Design a protein around this nucleic acid. Structure first.
Ligand SMILES: [Mg+2]
Ligand SMILES: [Zn+2]
Ligand SMILES: [Zn+2]
Ligand SMILES: [Zn+2]
Ligand SMILES: [Zn+2]
Lengths: 98, 258, 378, 66, 59, 51, 103, 152, 115, 47, 202, 95
RNA sequence: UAACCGGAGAGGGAACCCACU
């Protein structure tokens, strides 16, 4: 039930302390058009909260070349925080340093 | 004040399109004839579908829409029928509609192409264009899927729905060379010659003609298979003539009553 | 077509086009997106011309005859889920046709439209406030059925009955609704040119070339100069060359082998103005319009923001329980908020009577008694 | 899903030309010569067969029975 | 009332040859929700013919 | 200071150059939904009788 | 009792039967059961493939042929266009295209 | 009816309009009213409020009606003007070399409301009657106005 | 849901008059003919025929709203010619033109076929 | 005397399900099943 | 001010209706033919941009040689940045101006700019001649990586295209590096819009 | 038995793995589905990638809005231990 | 020297995410 709950509501934590957890980590897949499903499956998310008057975390840094799409961002209040992988960007899965 | 004297000269006549030139007529008349070619030419087309059973991957409304767009050979029956909304009968009758039937089931292993060969008709002269070249595909069925429906085709014209449009494309054109300067080219030499340009390859556009009206309106009426391409023109002229006659009768009634 | 098995999916809010088309000018990297196998849009003959003033201020004119031929026609699927349950010792929820002879709480709906099982049948023309799932809860019994959302108006597509984890009867019903593109529907291009369908003309009324080629969509020229979507013009120019060549052009971003002049050189080999313009004839009078119109195939999309899913009106509808004001939202038959900024807008107007009406008389009028000397709220 | 019966812009019947177009492309035809042979002159009608994607072939893979 | 909720066929006027179910009927007119279009029209009650939908045999 | 009000409608706006600058083209269902309370008078008793 | 005399592979239980047979073969540590399951799965796969090819024998085989031919023709068209590019290397003078030349 | 776009930033965001019922399902409004509401037609939505009394309808008609809101106290200038497409069209229309024949003038005059019913003397009588663009546009300017402006 | 039925562009309702004449008061010998359920197809030809009449001072037409099916033709003739008969003659001779065109097309067709 | 016939899923065999019955196919076992098309009059004015 | 508000009401409607009905005869459009610049103006554009690039190179040489004199108020590095920005602003403005005078009377960008309906001469400059310098926070593109703006450039490269100066036009297309720099420049507009909306309403 | 774990579609532990194109259609599914999402109560859920600061790395920032001239942050994290990441701070005072 | 029926609105909530101008 703990898995099934955190994956259903999106709150990353326990149900007794849900208001203290993260939110929106697990979202309903967007089956509206294939290009929306694919883009929802390769979506990044900077956890910086909204109501933020700062601009540096929202700006397209030079170092996002080839990793993050420099054009696909929401135009609302999440502009620059929600991102998208470039086509040939691969995220390392990890290995033992031994 | 009185009537100008229009002429006609058919340059190409096939069973699929007609190219003719109208001379000595006003632009408004020659363009209204074009508009009547598209909208106000009656034609028989499926406009009512009762689906007995449908198991195809196409939706019930998809089948109805596709059946609506199949052209039916209306050449002499169309001038006999009564408009559906103006007929006295309850439901449908031969005077105001052509019955159609399509009962199909796929049992063979290979997929069934539900073309227009499967549209049965209660009359021999009004059918999908199959007389004399593949046929319009309505549905594709797998093993165990079916389509069974009754349909009626009503007398209509392209002003209500595009299914009653008897033309593929009407190519209306006048004054090929820019003699009247009705259009201004920023660079006249970048523009290809019209098909009817009585102009050598040296000059770009005809020298300006200050006093001159548009005549010699070049048409290319292409049928969709329903009406023969000359019957389209004949019936369009008849229909515009009849619109004007009816309006004149109503105007006389308005005048005598004032 | 958002997925090839969309007929098995009992999704909430699915949209699929009747005749989606592959883009005539594509990038080489949309092959790996699988976009030519599940495309979203139709190549349309766009004419970038200010015609008759409705193709105006981000709006677009559309060819009504093209729509009649299935242009951008789409079907809208909505799914309703319901589950029976054991409410308690005394009360049980079950699917049965609500019946005034034994059920209380019945309403003005036509309950004859759904079968004895308690579920509407596949292929039944439903409408707003029609009963979709005949649930009854025994207390004799209270009609707790589920009704089609007000002003949805579709035809039941398929009805599935099964069990859930708890072994209770559980049905997901979905209703299809064909959506012809009317005026007010939102259409966009592949370059950021969003626009609503301003008005629809028949083929006889649209402008036409030297042959009977009329636009499917007419878009305002004033959309280009400030937004500088020159890629829209280059696409509208190369789609013509792709439709004449008879094979699909390339629009990879940084090609260096596809510049405007080479496309124009190709386009002039098929008997067209090398820059894409054409001599249109006014659809109303048949006279040539003195400016040669830019025209060509352009891959236009149909966005999900259809007007009939946004038109909303109210006149003394339901009311909230705590503060007896109109409900909120279109689905609840709520009323629009007369926010504070509107209050200030009316204050600046000096229209104190309209302000009073809006904030007191059309929202929540009430009366109380009060003492003339000491008592408060008697 | 399936080839449109008529060209959206013109009105010319293109519903009986998808299979013939596929056959001509089964031959070594260049993609434009097939349209030219099918009597499609206007580019509005040519785009109907150029851009069409036949999904009804993919939907028929979900056999109801057998 | 009497024919509310029944399937009718509009047998006259512009909406000839249309099937729908009567949403509300009065002594003069009736509101038929058309089966094909997504609309409810108000037709006169003499323009209508009841078609019904029943199955015989029941055994 | 801010409430929800009866007799209000919301819809997508679209251009119409044929309307006068002081005219708004409402659709037919919105006009057929909301009402205006009108007093009866010997002046307009027949119009409202027919309505 | 119905499944007793009615064959399992009729008609839509094929893929589910394939998965169940693979699970049964995997769950058994005995070689005889594994071999019997392998033979049964091979026979069922052959029968199902024959049935699927028979159904797709018409109207879907054709478009698969023309799709393989389309992509093959495209890989041929690309290389012939590339040889044309290599051949047309006489003079490239058109203006409207540029590239960076810093430093 | 009084008509609003929810970002009601200034007084001209809630101007009052006369209603006309039209077939399709959208709030159609004149182009020139775009600038007051800052409301393009890419999908924008606006709220319609219907007053519910004579004392309120009269107040709206006499205080908030659209033509009474042409000039704004914010900057003493108009806020509604000939804008967007019709401005380019009118610039091209008023060029010195725009000439029209009787058949086009008599069609354009059909769209003037305050036309006095008299066709003005064409600017060119021979070799052929031709009307200059300014000649037709002078019929649209009301009354006897006197102003001097400079083209861009 | 608010889409008008397509038959409303040519089918008259009950009570509507096909054509309605109103005398214009702002100038003498001027009328306004209001045709219901018509469009540029029938207004344009009438107008263009009226401009060939030498006794017609003014002729013009409009479609007041593209969503409404009605045209307003305005005629103004000389004092010795009422616009009623101007309009009537401009429809009569227009019908004659179209009938002549029908006849000449019909003969040219049979001359083209095996000829 | 109509028993409310359903169509199975994986089976596609018509089953007779009355009230107070478990939704399972008469053969092979299936908890998913759909409903048959209506017998009401389906008429589309094709447009 | 002279007539009432009703006569002006009819004035507005009459202008719209009469002019839009004439627009059915005149017609109006925009297309690729309005962006092409006749191949004579392209030579001027290229020459101006190349001379600007050479001037920037000379300024860089002077700075590296410590020959660049600090202008009043500004420091050495700040005056170098001001010099480069001044030179590239001159380049963009001059190329745009040359583009303006090359447009034919029938050019549909000019018809929409001189009417004032939509667009500005800067949009014509960017579409036809050159897009220009892309700034973020008022400065040229910053060294996001270690002493360079992208991996494709070399450390300590202050040249035009190394720091964001877009030298192509929207008709000729953007080189990938300057495409990314243009995206960086354009993100500022979206961020500022999203924060302005919430900051001014309060 | 410990409990149920939700499986992401088209993973190495989904029934829809390494499966051919005939079989995906036989199971009424599409061969174009990318996978990568969970089914939770019949709803397709996607885990959106969350970015953070890289652990076990030194960062020297300069917070001007405090008493410190510099701050050598280091978010240390051994490896997915039951102890969440802990951070050192070797800062320098302003004076 | 006679004539059968009368009942009316079922009335619901927080949070988070996504999206639109
Ligand atoms: Mg907008
Ligand atoms: Zn009949
Ligand atoms: Zn008291
Ligand atoms: Zn076509
Ligand atoms: Zn079972």
């Amino acid at each position: 039930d703990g898995l099934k709950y955190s994956l259903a509501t999106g709150n990353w934590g326990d149900q007794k302390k849900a208001h203290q957890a993260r939110a929106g980590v697990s979202q309903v897949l967007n089956r509206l058009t294939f290009a929306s499903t694919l883009s929802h499956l390769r979506r990044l998310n900077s956890p910086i909260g909204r109501d933020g008057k700062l601009a540096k975390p929202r700006q397209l840094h030079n170092t996002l070349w080839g990793m993050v799409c420099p054009a696909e961002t929401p135009e609302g209040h999440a502009v620059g925080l929600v991102k998208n992988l470039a086509l040939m960007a691969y995220i390392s899965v990890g290995s033992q340093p031994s | 004040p009185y009537a100008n004297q229009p002429t006609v000269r058919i340059t190409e006549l096939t069973d699929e399109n007609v190219k003719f030139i109208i001379e000595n007529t006003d632009l408004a008349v020659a363009n209204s004839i074009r508009r009547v070619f598209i909208a106000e030419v009656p034609i028989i087309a499926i406009d009512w579908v009762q689906i007995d059973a449908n198991s195809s991957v196409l939706h019930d409304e998809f089948i109805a829409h596709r059946l609506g767009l199949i052209p039916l050979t209306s050449d002499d029956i169309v001038d006999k029928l009564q408009y559906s909304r103006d007929c006295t009968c309850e439901e449908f009758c031969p005077e105001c509609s052509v019955e159609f039937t399509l009962d199909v089931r796929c049992n063979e292993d290979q997929t069934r192409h539900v073309t227009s060969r499967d549209l049965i008709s209660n009359s021999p002269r009004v059918i999908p264009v199959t007389s004399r070249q593949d046929d319009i595909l309505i549905v594709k069925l797998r093993k165990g899927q079916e389509l069974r429906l009754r349909a009626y085709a009503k007398k209509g014209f392209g002003k209500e729905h595009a299914k009653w449009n008897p033309t593929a494309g009407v190519a209306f054109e006048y004054d090929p060379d820019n003699a009247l300067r009705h259009t201004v080219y920023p660079k006249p030499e970048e523009w290809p010659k019209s098909e009817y340009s009585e102009l050598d390859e040296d000059e770009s556009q005809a020298p300006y003609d200050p006093n001159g009206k548009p005549e010699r309106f070049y048409y290319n009426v292409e049928s969709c298979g329903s009406l023969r391409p000359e019957t389209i023109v004949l019936s369009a002229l008849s229909g515009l003539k009849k619109k004007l006659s009816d309006l004149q009768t109503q105007l006389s009634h308005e005048i005598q009553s004032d | 077509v958002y997925i090839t098995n969309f007929h098995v999916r009992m999704d909430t809010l699915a949209h699929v086009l009747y005749y989606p088309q592959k883009p005539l000018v594509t990038t080489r990297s949309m092959e790996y997106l699988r976009f030519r196998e599940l495309p979203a849009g139709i190549n349309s003959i766009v004419a970038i011309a200010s015609y008759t003033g409705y193709n105006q201020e981000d709006s677009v004119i559309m060819n009504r005859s093209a729509v009649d031929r299935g242009f951008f026609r789409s079907v809208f699927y909505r799914s309703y889920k319901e589950q029976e349950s054991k409410k308690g010792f005394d009360q049980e929820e079950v699917f049965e046709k609500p019946t005034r002879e034994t059920c209380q709480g019945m309403r003005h709906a036509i309950y004859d439209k759904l079968d004895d099982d308690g579920l509407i049948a596949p292929g039944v023309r439903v409408s707003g406030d029609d009963v979709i799932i005949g649930k009854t809860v025994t207390l004799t019994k209270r009609d707790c059925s589920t009704f089609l959302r007000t002003s949805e108006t579709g035809i039941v597509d398929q009805v599935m009955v099964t069990l859930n984890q708890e072994g209770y009867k559980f049905c997901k019903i979905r209703v299809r609704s064909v959506r012809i593109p009317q005026i007010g529907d939102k259409f966009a291009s592949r370059h950021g040119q969003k626009g609503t369908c301003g008005i629809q003309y028949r083929q006889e009324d649209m402008p036409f070339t030297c042959e009977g080629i009329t636009p499917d969509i007419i878009i305002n020229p004033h959309a280009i100069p400030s937004r500088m979507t020159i890629g829209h013009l280059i696409e509208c120019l190369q789609g013509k060359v792709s439709a004449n060549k008879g094979e699909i052009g390339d629009a990879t971003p940084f090609n260096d082998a596809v510049n405007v002049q080479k496309i124009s050189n190709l386009l002039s080999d098929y008997g067209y103005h090398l820059r894409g313009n054409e001599v249109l004839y006014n659809g109303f009078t048949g006279r040539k319009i003195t400016s040669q119109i830019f025209i060509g195939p352009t891959y236009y999309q149909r966005l999900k923001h259809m007007v009939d899913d946004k038109i909303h009106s109210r006149a003394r509808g339901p009311i909230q329980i705590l503060n007896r004001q109109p409900m909120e939202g279109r689905s609840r038959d709520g009323g629009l908020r007369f926010g504070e900024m509107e209050r200030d807008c009316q204050i600046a107007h000096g229209a104190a009577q309209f302000l009073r009406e809006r904030l007191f008389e059309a929202s929540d009028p009430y009366q109380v008694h009060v003492c003339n000397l000491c008592g408060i709220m008697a | 899903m399936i080839i449109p019966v008529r060209c959206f812009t013109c009105g010319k019947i293109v519903g009986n030309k998808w299979e013939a177009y596929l056959g001509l492309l089964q031959a070594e035809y260049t993609e434009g010569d097939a349209l030219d042979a099918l009597g499609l002159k206007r580019y509005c009608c040519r785009r109907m067969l150029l851009a069409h994607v036949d999904l009804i072939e993919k939907l028929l893979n979900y056999a109801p029975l057998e | 009332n009497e024919l509310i909720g029944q399937t009718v066929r509009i047998s006259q006027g512009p909406y000839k040859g249309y099937i729908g179910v009567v949403k509300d009927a009065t002594e003069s007119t009736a509101r038929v929700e058309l089966h094909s279009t997504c609309q409810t029209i108000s037709v006169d009650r003499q323009r209508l013919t009841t078609v019904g939908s029943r199955r015989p045999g029941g055994m | 200071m801010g409430k929800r009000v009866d007799f209000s409608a919301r819809t997508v706006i679209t251009p119409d150059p044929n309307l006068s600058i002081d005219q708004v083209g409402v659709p037919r269902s919105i006009a057929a939904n909301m009402t205006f309370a009108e007093i009866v008078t010997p002046f307009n008793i027949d119009r409202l009788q027919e309505l | 009792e119905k499944e007793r005399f009615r064959k399992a592979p009729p008609n839509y239980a094929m893929k589910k039967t394939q998965l169940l047979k693979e699970k049964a073969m995997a769950e058994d540590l005995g070689d005889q059961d594994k071999a019997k399951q392998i033979q049964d799965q091979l026979n069922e796969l052959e029968e199902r493939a024959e049935a699927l090819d028979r159904q797709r024998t018409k109207n879907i085989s054709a478009i698969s042929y023309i799709n393989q031919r389309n992509r093959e023709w495209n890989i041929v068209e690309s290389e012939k266009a590339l040889v044309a590019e290599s051949h047309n290397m006489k003079n490239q003078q058109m203006d409207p295209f540029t590239r960076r030349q810093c430093k | 009816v009084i008509f609003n776009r929810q970002p009601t930033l200034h007084k001209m965001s809630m101007m009052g309009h006369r209603v006309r019922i039209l077939p399709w399902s959208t709030f159609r409004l004149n182009l020139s009213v775009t600038t007051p509401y800052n409301a393009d037609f890419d999908g924008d939505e606006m709220n319609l409020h219907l007053p519910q009394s004579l004392e309120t309808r009269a107040e709206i008609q006499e205080l908030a009606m659209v033509p009474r809101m042409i000039v704004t106290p914010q900057s003493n200038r108009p806020v509604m003007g000939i804008v967007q497409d019709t401005l380019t069209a009118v610039r091209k229309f008023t060029k010195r070399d725009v000439f029209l024949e009787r058949g086009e003038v008599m069609n354009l005059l059909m769209f003037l409301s305050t036309w006095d019913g008299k066709v003005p003397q064409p600017a060119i009588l021979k070799p052929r009657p031709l009307w200059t663009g300014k000649q037709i546009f002078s019929l649209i300017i009301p009354g006897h106005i006197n102003c001097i402006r400079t083209h861009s | 849901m608010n889409a008008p039925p397509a038959f409303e562009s040519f089918l008259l309702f009950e009570g509507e008059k096909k054509i309605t004449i109103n005398k214009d008061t702002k100038v003498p010998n001027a009328c306004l003919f209001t045709i219901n359920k018509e469009d540029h197809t029938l207004g344009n030809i009438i107008k263009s025929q009226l401009l060939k009449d030498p006794q017609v001072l003014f002729a013009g037409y409009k479609v007041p709203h593209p969503l409404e099916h009605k045209i307003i033709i305005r005629v103004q003739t000389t004092p010795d010619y009422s616009p009623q008969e101007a309009f009537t003659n401009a429809i009569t001779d227009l019908i004659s033109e179209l009938s002549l065109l029908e006849e000449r097309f019909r003969v040219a067709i049979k001359d083209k076929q095996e000829g | 005397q109509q028993p409310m016939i359903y169509i199975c899923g994986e089976c596609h065999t018509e089953n007779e399900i009355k009230s107070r019955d478990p939704i399972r196919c008469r053969e092979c076992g299936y908890r998913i099943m759909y409903k048959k098309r209506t017998k009401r009059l389906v008429v589309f004015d094709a447009r | 001010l002279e007539m009432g508000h009703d006569i002006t009401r009819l004035f507005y409607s009459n202008i719209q209706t009469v002019i839009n009905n004439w627009l059915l005869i005149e017609g109006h459009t925009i297309g690729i033919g309005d962006s092409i610049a006749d191949s004579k103006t392209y030579q001027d554009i290229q020459n101006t941009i190349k001379k600007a690039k050479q001037d920037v190179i000379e300024v860089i040489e002077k700075a590296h040689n410590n020959e660049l004199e600090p202008t009043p108020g500004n420091t050495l590095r700040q005056t170098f940045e001001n010099q480069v920005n001044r030179i590239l602003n001159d380049a963009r403005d001059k190329t745009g101006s040359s583009a303006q005078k090359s447009l034919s009377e029938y050019n549909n960008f000019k018809s929409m700019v001189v009417s004032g309906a939509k667009g500005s001469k800067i949009n014509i400059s960017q579409v036809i001649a050159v897009v220009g310098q892309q700034n973020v926070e008022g400065k040229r593109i910053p060294f996001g990586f270690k002493h360079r703006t992208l991996p494709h450039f070399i450390k300590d490269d202050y040249g035009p295209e190394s720091r964001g100066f877009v030298e192509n036009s929207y008709l000729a297309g953007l080189t990938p590096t300057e495409f990314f720099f243009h995206a960086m420049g354009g993100r500022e507009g979206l961020i500022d819009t999203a924060v302005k909306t919430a900051e001014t309403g309060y | 038995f410990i409990g149920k774990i939700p499986i992401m579609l088209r993973s190495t532990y989904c029934l829809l793995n390494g499966l051919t194109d005939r079989d995906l259609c036989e199971l009424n599914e599409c061969p174009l589905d990318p996978g990568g999402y969970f089914i939770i109560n019949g709803s397709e859920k996607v885990l959106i990638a969350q970015e953070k600061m890289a652990t076990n790395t030194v960062y020297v920032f300069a917070k001007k809005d405090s008493k410190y001239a510099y701050t050598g942050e280091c978010r240390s994290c051994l490896e997915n231990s039951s102890r969440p990441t802990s951070t050192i701070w070797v800062s320098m005072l302003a004076r």
